[PDB]
Amino acid sequence: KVFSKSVPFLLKPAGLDGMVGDVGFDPLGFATFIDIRWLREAELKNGRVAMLAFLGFIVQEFIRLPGDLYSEPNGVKAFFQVGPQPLLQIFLFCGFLEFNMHKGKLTQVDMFEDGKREPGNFGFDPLGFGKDPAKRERYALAELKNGRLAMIAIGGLVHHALVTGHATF
Amino acid sequence: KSTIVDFNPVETSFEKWAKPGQFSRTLAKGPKTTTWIWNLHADAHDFDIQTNSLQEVSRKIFSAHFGQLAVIFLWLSGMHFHGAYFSNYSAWLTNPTSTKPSAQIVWPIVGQEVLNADVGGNFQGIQITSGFFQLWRAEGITSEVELYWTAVGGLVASFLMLFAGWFHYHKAAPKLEWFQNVESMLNHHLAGLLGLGSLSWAGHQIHIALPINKLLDLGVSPEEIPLPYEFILNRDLIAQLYPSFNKGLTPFFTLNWGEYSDFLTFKGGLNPVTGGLWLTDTAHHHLAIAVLFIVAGHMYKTNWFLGHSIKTILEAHKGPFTGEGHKGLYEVLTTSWHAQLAINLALFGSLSIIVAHHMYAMPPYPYIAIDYPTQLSLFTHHVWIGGFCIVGGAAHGAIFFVRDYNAANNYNNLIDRVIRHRDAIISHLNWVCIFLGCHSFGLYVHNDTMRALGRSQDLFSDNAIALKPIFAQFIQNLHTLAPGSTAPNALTTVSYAFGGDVISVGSKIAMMPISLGTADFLVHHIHAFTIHVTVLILLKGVLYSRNSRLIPDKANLGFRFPCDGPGRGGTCQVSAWDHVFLGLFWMYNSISIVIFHFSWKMQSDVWGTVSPTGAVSHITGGNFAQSSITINGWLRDFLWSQAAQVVQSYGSSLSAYGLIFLGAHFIWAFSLMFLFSGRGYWQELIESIVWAHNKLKVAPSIQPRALSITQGRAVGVAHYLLGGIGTTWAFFLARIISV
Amino acid sequence: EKSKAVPFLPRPAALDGSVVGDVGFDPVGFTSWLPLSYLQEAEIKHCRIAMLATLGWIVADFVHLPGAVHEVSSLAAHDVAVKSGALAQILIWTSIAEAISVIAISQMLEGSGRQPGDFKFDPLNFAKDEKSLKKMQLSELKNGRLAMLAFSGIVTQAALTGHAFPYM
Amino acid sequence: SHTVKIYDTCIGCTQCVRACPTDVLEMVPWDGCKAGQIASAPRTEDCVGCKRCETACPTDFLSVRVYLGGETTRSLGLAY
Amino acid sequence: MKDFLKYLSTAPVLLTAWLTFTAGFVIEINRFYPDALTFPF
Amino acid sequence: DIGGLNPCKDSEVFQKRLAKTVKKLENRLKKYEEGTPPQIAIQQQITQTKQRFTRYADSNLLCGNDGLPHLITDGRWSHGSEFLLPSILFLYISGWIGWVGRKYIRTVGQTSNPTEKEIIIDVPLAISIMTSGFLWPFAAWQEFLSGDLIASDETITTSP
Numbered sequence A: 001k002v003f004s005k006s007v008p009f010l011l012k013p014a015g016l017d018g019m020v021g022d023v024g025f026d027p028l029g030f031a032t033f034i035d036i037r038w039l040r041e042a043e044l045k046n047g048r049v050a051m052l053a054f055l056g057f058i059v060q061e062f063i064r065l066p067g068d069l070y071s072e073p074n075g076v077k078a079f080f081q082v083g084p085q086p087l088l089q090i091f092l093f094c095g096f097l098e099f100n101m102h103k104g105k106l107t108q109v110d111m112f113e114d115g116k117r118e119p120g121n122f123g124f125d126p127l128g129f130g131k132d133p134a135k136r137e138r139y140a141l142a143e144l145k146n147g148r149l150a151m152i153a154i155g156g157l158v159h160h161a162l163v164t165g166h167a168t169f
Numbered sequence B: 001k002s003t004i005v006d007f008n009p010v011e012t013s014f015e016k017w018a019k020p021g022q023f024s025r026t027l028a029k030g031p032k033t034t035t036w037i038w039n040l041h042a043d044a045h046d047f048d049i050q051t052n053s054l055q056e057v058s059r060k061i062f063s064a065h066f067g068q069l070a071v072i073f074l075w076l077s078g079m080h081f082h083g084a085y086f087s088n089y090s091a092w093l094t095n096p097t098s099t100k101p102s103a104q105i106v107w108p109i110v111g112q113e114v115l116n117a118d119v120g121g122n123f124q125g126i127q128i129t130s131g132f133f134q135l136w137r138a139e140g141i142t143s144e145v146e147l148y149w150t151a152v153g154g155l156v157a158s159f160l161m162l163f164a165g166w167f168h169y170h171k172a173a174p175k176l177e178w179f180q181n182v183e184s185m186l187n188h189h190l191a192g193l194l195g196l197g198s199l200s201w202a203g204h205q206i207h208i209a210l211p212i213n214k215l216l217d218l219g220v221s222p223e224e225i226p227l228p229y230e231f232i233l234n235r236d237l238i239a240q241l242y243p244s245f246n247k248g249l250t251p252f253f254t255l256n257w258g259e260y261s262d263f264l265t266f267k268g269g270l271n272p273v274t275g276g277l278w279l280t281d282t283a284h285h286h287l288a289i290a291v292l293f294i295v296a297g298h299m300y301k302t303n304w305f306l307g308h309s310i311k312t313i314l315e316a317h318k319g320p321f322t323g324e325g326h327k328g329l330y331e332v333l334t335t336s337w338h339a340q341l342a343i344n345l346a347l348f349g350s351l352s353i354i355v356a357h358h359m360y361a362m363p364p365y366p367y368i369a370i371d372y373p374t375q376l377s378l379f380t381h382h383v384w385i386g387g388f389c390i391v392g393g394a395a396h397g398a399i400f401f402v403r404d405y406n407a408a409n410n411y412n413n414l415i416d417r418v419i420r421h422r423d424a425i426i427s428h429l430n431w432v433c434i435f436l437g438c439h440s441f442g443l444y445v446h447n448d449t450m451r452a453l454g455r456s457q458d459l460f461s462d463n464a465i466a467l468k469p470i471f472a473q474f475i476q477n478l479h480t481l482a483p484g485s486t487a488p489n490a491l492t493t494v495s496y497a498f499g500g501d502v503i504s505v506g507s508k509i510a511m512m513p514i515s516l517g518t519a520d521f522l523v524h525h526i527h528a529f530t531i532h533v534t535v536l537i538l539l540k541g542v543l544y545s546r547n548s549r550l551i552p553d554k555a556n557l558g559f560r561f562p563c564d565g566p567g568r569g570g571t572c573q574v575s576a577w578d579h580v581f582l583g584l585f586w587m588y589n590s591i592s593i594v595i596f597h598f599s600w601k602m603q604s605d606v607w608g609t610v611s612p613t614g615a616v617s618h619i620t621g622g623n624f625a626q627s628s629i630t631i632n633g634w635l636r637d638f639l640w641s642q643a644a645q646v647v648q649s650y651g652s653s654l655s656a657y658g659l660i661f662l663g664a665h666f667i668w669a670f671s672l673m674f675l676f677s678g679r680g681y682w683q684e685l686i687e688s689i690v691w692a693h694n695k696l697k698v699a700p701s702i703q704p705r706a707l708s709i710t711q712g713r714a715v716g717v718a719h720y721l722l723g724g725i726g727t728t729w730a731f732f733l734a735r736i737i738s739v
Numbered sequence C: 001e002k003s004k005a006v007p008f009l010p011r012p013a014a015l016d017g018s019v020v021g022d023v024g025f026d027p028v029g030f031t032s033w034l035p036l037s038y039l040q041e042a043e044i045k046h047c048r049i050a051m052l053a054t055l056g057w058i059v060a061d062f063v064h065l066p067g068a069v070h071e072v073s074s075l076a077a078h079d080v081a082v083k084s085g086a087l088a089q090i091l092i093w094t095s096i097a098e099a100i101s102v103i104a105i106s107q108m109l110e111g112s113g114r115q116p117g118d119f120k121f122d123p124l125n126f127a128k129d130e131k132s133l134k135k136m137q138l139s140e141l142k143n144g145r146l147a148m149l150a151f152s153g154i155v156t157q158a159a160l161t162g163h164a165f166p167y168m
Numbered sequence D: 001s002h003t004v005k006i007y008d009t010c011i012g013c014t015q016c017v018r019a020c021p022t023d024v025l026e027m028v029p030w031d032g033c034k035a036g037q038i039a040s041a042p043r044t045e046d047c048v049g050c051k052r053c054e055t056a057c058p059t060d061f062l063s064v065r066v067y068l069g070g071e072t073t074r075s076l077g078l079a080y
Numbered sequence E: 001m002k003d004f005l006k007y008l009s010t011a012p013v014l015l016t017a018w019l020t021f022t023a024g025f026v027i028e029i030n031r032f033y034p035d036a037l038t039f040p041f
Numbered sequence F: 001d002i003g004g005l006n007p008c009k010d011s012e013v014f015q016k017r018l019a020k021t022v023k024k025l026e027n028r029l030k031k032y033e034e035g036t037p038p039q040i041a042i043q044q045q046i047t048q049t050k051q052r053f054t055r056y057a058d059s060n061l062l063c064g065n066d067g068l069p070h071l072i073t074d075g076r077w078s079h080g081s082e083f084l085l086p087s088i089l090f091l092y093i094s095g096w097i098g099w100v101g102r103k104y105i106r107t108v109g110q111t112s113n114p115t116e117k118e119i120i121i122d123v124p125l126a127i128s129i130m131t132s133g134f135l136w137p138f139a140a141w142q143e144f145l146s147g148d149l150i151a152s153d154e155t156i157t158t159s160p
């Protein structure tokens, strides 16, 4: 028996072999009954959204926009003060982005049905970082780790605002 | 390698949990139509068709009994836990006559918190009609901590019974010879179970319930009453209430049992403080029952040259009119589980009905006679359980006749001779049923039409043509004269229902002489007629379960089959199951009439309030005597009149009873769709629905089929019973809680 | 035959010699109908939990964390900690650890090779070869059993008599 | 008496004949199927209409069909 | 835990779990926002 | 206004209903003692009743002559939160349920044992299909266009 590298008292999970964040961490075996490509796509998207949202917290409490609506240093209270109209526009824009970036196939059964789709690979690289394949793997691992850390931190900041109410500081 | 058990017969594995229908040879292949799903649950406990060995069936039955007892223990633990945590039992103890027992609080969601009634004692919740508070008080339970510990013990016992079932199916399963030791089983169930349970309960009553309840009746608050264990360690806390414990057990071993007359009395009647039976009388009763049952347990020969053989007893009881007599009955009852189930279920339902009668007749718990909702609910529930169990006993007798009956082994015995003249039995029972129905009901209809025609002197009433139940009144007179004449050591009659004084607790009547007039004559004959018709249906099912003049090979079609075909003019419902279906309907009718008679008679001529000068005013006002003799009277002065509380319960804490009233009406009417219709129409409608699904590519792989004819009948009867019983349940509960 | 612990009782027939802390003590034959690895894991879990619990009870009756909520005796600390939510955090993280334990014990029972109670947690070494590991396993088992009995006595005495650290 | 008809979809599996409770059906030689036999109904005066015959028919929509008609003491199953 | 998980995948257990979850979130929506006769927006 | 109804904010009978309910609840509250849980529960009932009546008053709700909110479901967007928005919400949810059920039926209908996978659900595949129902309006008007939504003549028909 091999046993996992992360959880040393557990057997090595299956389906994670050719990935860019494999430390053998899957005690519940989510990769066995869920497609690993979909799981990586979801992890990357959740991580990127969490990173953007954490940066949004830190900037919102600091900078903010001119106007009476955009005057709440607290993100949770800003979600309510801003009203539904600005939020629904963000929702529709995110939907438009989702549709055009995945080119129609948006669901768990439709995406990766034909393969030829690296999980999380939207081809988005205008600044050109990533031409060298040597640093590409390191960049992918850094993105994954930062995304996970940002998921934890996004939960932390949101719940700090809920239990205190003032801000993050 | 024990001689009674087999070790590790079945492996404890989850593999068969993932293969539904593995028990059945036909269902194991997997579902092809939706009929497979229904067949899966209809054959789950039919262990006879799952194995060909009586040993395996017996082991499955034994483990199923353990599972059932674990379920019962879990239910009891839940009841005690609710009494401990979500009840006003402590408040009810200090004010039994003014606080309504409640042991279930309702969460505040969707406005349902209105169900939390003003039960009293600074409590909000649902009023409890199961009488647990009175039972706990009779047990001497004076604190909610004791209820919590009883709940914990119930949980432990439930786990123990689950473990016992698992152990005796998978680790050590008893052999067939162990199960067939009916002599040993009877000896143990009679001495150990019954007698030693009575003895242990008598000990508990004498040492815990007798002193604690005596202190409670004396006015001592539950907080200053000593803890129950102190009544055992200290022979002076109990010797003050009953000054006979000072002599210890010496009077018992010296045969001077007269010294124990302090706490082993024979009084009769009711406790004037609580309205229940004297707990000293109860303890003496349980002691006598224990001795009698222990003695009765030393009857059958088990392992020594001592006792009786049931085979030799039965085989010696022949006669000129009965041929071989009881020869072969021992083989029938030791090789067929269905025959044992028939006898046990019939006698068990009859026992439940007898219990229901003796409950209200002689209230055995403190402050339970003045809790009218508890009395009504207990009587109705126990009578319903008795009727259901009796129908089940008839059903399993029919099942035994179809499946486990061997013609060769029963040559010219009682079973054979009964089948040989089944025609005579059924024809005479038919004549008796027609006679009883004609008379009882047509006397009711004659009263109704005489009243409708303005001829009040032509009725079958007390102020008219009178049918006095003289035989029952003679018995009532004999019982009220028994103390001092035939029961010379009695101080009071067994029940005040036979006659005597009005017993009131807190201005509320506990018991009172139940007068019998022409109204009781008619309703008693209605009871006899309904019981006779139910017996007719069930006995026709049992006797004609194997063959008939219509179908000479009905036994080859099994116990459960819809018909033999449209031929012979139509052979619907010829099974024996279709007789347990019709008998279920008629049992519902009979029990409904019985509980209606009880409710109206008690409310009109027993229950009520007593004025300080001794004037008795009842709940309804004595309208039973003159208005229960016509069907219009039953419709108006009982159904319409006492349904006022149910229909006016909206917005109050009894609104749940009105909602259940309406829902039970809905379910009862829903049943008639299955009872009146047939399978072909529903199959052909499912055909068009399946066409639509196929048109939308959503037709299931498991082909949807209409419920089988037998399952359609079963669904119809189940819904009918549920709707009717629920309607009566809501009506009774709302009416008797409001007033 | 003739188990070491109870010399007049037969050997439990499931504990020959190949378990740490195996003196053949199973009079009521719990090992005759339950997996040995399952019972070993349960015993080791109880040992560790009760060792931590005894140390915490004794220490918290001496040293208190800053704050008014932490100014109660260990006997009355349960109702205070549950109200403050202190025990909720322990419950959450213990539940996470116990779900991972569900996975681990399932894998151990269905093959794998993980010894009962072996989570491979060993930042320091303290056990370099087989002999040291066996000796330290025996020490852990004996200390855990002693601490289970000690916590039992501590709680029973403290509940009987509401005394401080000397629960006599 | 009821009417019983046999159709050439008969596969000669004999399940109808051995299910008749009143000896109405019988197997007769034929050349339209592998078994070389076809069911016949020469004693329909004893037909009771129980339709056990077509409950045992394996062919798609039956090869034996029972049409209920005039009633008789034999067809009504009257022992009296 | 290979056949136990298959047992939990049966129709009755899955339907019971799904209906329990469904009733749960319905009841909790009605607890946190009770007496909702019209759409909140 | 619409249909002769009037806003509940100006309906006297509505306020009479509120006052009567509050009075009944307070009378019930009078028979308990101090800050005991029954009094807390009755006070919560009173607070919830007042909040519900206030919300119904300030909700563009039309009340009849009985002082009860009447629903205007003719289709006008003015009273669109009474029927139209809940209608859209239910249509979305029910279309989701139907779509995931149909997709699961068609997916396990092409396996070796289609009937087995209906009593013993393939929970991985079931979860995969169920979370994909958020696009059911788009998936339906992408399968109907391709002719994959409707069968044509392989469907069975009775004799006539």
Ligand code: CLA
Residues within 6 Å of the ligand: B061, B062, B065, B066, B069, B178, B179, B181, B182, B184, B185, B188, B189, B191, B192, B193
């Ligand atoms: C004095 C001895 C004794 C006692 C008390 C019982 C008691 C019981 N037997 Mg039993 N039995 C006995 C001897 C005894 N049996 C013998 C010698 C045989 C062999 C012929 C059987 C064969 C037998 C069968 C085949 C069945 C029973 C069943 C039952 C139960 C009937 C259900 C009931 O009334 O609920 C009353 C319930 C209670 C009062 C709850 C408390 C009872 C607990 C469990 C004590 C049980 C005593 C037990 C025999 C002690 C053995 C302990 C074990 C470690 C050896 C009841 C618990 C039936 C049953 O329900 O199966 C489980 C059943 O199907 N018995």
Ligand code: CLA
Residues within 6 Å of the ligand: B041, B042, B043, B044, B045, B046, B047, B345, B388, B389, B390, B391, B392, B393, B395, B399, B559, B560, B577, B580, B581, B584, B718, B722
């Ligand atoms: C000690 C009691 C007892 C026992 C051990 C049995 C045991 C048995 N009976 Mg039996 N029976 C009993 C009492 C009993 N019965 C009673 C009291 C009646 C009269 C109604 C019957 C009537 C009866 C018939 C008519 C038949 C049996 C059959 C059987 C056998 C198969 C049972 C099965 O698979 O059902 C599995 C269990 C179910 C299908 C459960 C069905 C659910 C019920 C009907 C509804 C319960 C609703 C419940 C009250 C909650 C409603 C509340 C609502 C708000 C939701 C089995 C040997 C059958 C057989 O073939 O025997 C060989 C058969 O045809 N019995």
Ligand code: CLA
Residues within 6 Å of the ligand: B429, B430, B431, B433, B434, B435, B436, B437, B438, B441, B442, B445, B533, B536, B537, B582, B583, B585, B586
């Ligand atoms: C109100 C409806 C109703 C009525 C009146 C009856 C009546 C009867 N049922 Mg029942 N039954 C009912 C509903 C009813 N049933 C339902 C819903 C079911 C479904 C489960 C059944 C299922 C059922 C079964 C399975 C059986 C019966 C049997 C009986 C008969 C018992 C013998 C008897 O009393 O005959 C006497 C007749 C009456 C009491 C009816 C009223 C007669 C009046 C009062 C006296 C005579 C009037 C006079 C002749 C009128 C002449 C004037 C006229 C010509 C103008 C009786 C005919 C049993 C049977 O066959 O009989 C033994 C039987 O086995 N029934």
Ligand code: CLA
Residues within 6 Å of the ligand: C049, C052, C053, C055, C056, C057, C059, C060, C061, C063, C064, C065, C066, C069, C070, C071, C072, C073, C074, C077, C078, C081, C086, C087, C090, C093, C094, C097
């Ligand atoms: C079974 C384990 C256990 C449990 C349930 C508790 C529970 C409690 N302790 Mg406690 N404690 C423990 C072990 C335990 N302790 C140990 C081993 C020590 C010695 C360091 C202490 C020292 C201690 C002090 C000094 C105080 C408490 C206090 C308290 C109470 C509230 C605050 C709190 O949770 O402690 C906070 C706990 C600490 C600050 C130290 C805990 C150190 C841990 C147990 C050692 C490392 C283990 C590791 C983290 C395990 C990982 C778990 C895994 C699932 C990830 C609460 C009743 C406080 C109180 O109210 O007293 C009445 C208080 O003042 N404890």
Ligand SMILES: CC(/C=C/C=C(C)/C=C/[C@@]12O[C@]1(C)C[C@@H](O)CC2(C)C)=C\C=C\C=C(C)\C=C\C=C(C)\C=C\[C@@]12O[C@]1(C)C[C@@H](O)CC2(C)C
Residues within 6 Å of the ligand: A144, A145, A146, A148, A149, A152, A163, C084, C085, C086, C088, C089, C092
């Ligand atoms: C921090 C955390 C996890 C941190 C892990 C980190 C950062 C490391 C992550 C990584 O290394 C991995 C793993 C793998 C790498 O490939 C990726 C990176 C990213 C490198 C979880 C916190 C988890 C935090 C949790 C669970 C907090 C729960 C708090 C609760 C429940 C509070 C409740 C109360 O506040 C209320 C509600 C009311 C009050 O009155 C009472 C109380 C009780 C106090």
Ligand SMILES: CC(/C=C/C=C(C)/C=C/[C@@]12O[C@]1(C)C[C@@H](O)CC2(C)C)=C\C=C\C=C(C)\C=C\C=C(C)\C=C\[C@@]12O[C@]1(C)C[C@@H](O)CC2(C)C
Residues within 6 Å of the ligand: A075, A076, A079, A151, A152, A154, A155, A156, A158, C096
């Ligand atoms: C609990 C949690 C993470 C827990 C992580 C744990 C335990 C990790 C443990 C480990 O790492 C360690 C410790 C060590 C590792 O080696 C092993 C593991 C085991 C992996 C994240 C919560 C994460 C929680 C998150 C992200 C919640 C975000 C909430 C948002 C955005 C809410 C928005 C709103 O609330 C507003 C603002 C207004 C409302 O009215 C409307 C809405 C819209 C609802």
Ligand SMILES: CC1=C(C/C=C(\C)CCC[C@H](C)CCC[C@H](C)CCCC(C)C)C(=O)c2ccccc2C1=O
Residues within 6 Å of the ligand: B673, B674, B675, B677, B678, B679, B682, B705, B706, B707, B708, B709, B711, B712, B713
């Ligand atoms: C409607 C009907 C059907 C069709 C009924 C069917 C197909 C039953 C469908 C049951 C569904 C599929 C499952 C049950 C759904 C309920 C909502 C669950 C019960 C409610 C719980 C609270 C118990 C018959 O097959 C039938 C057969 C013979 C005589 C009469 C009838 C008959 O009336």
Ligand code: SF4
Residues within 6 Å of the ligand: B562, B563, B564, B565, B566, B570, B571, B572, B573, B678, B709
């Ligand atoms: S279907 Fe109904 S009617 Fe036709 S035979 Fe069977 S039972 Fe008699």
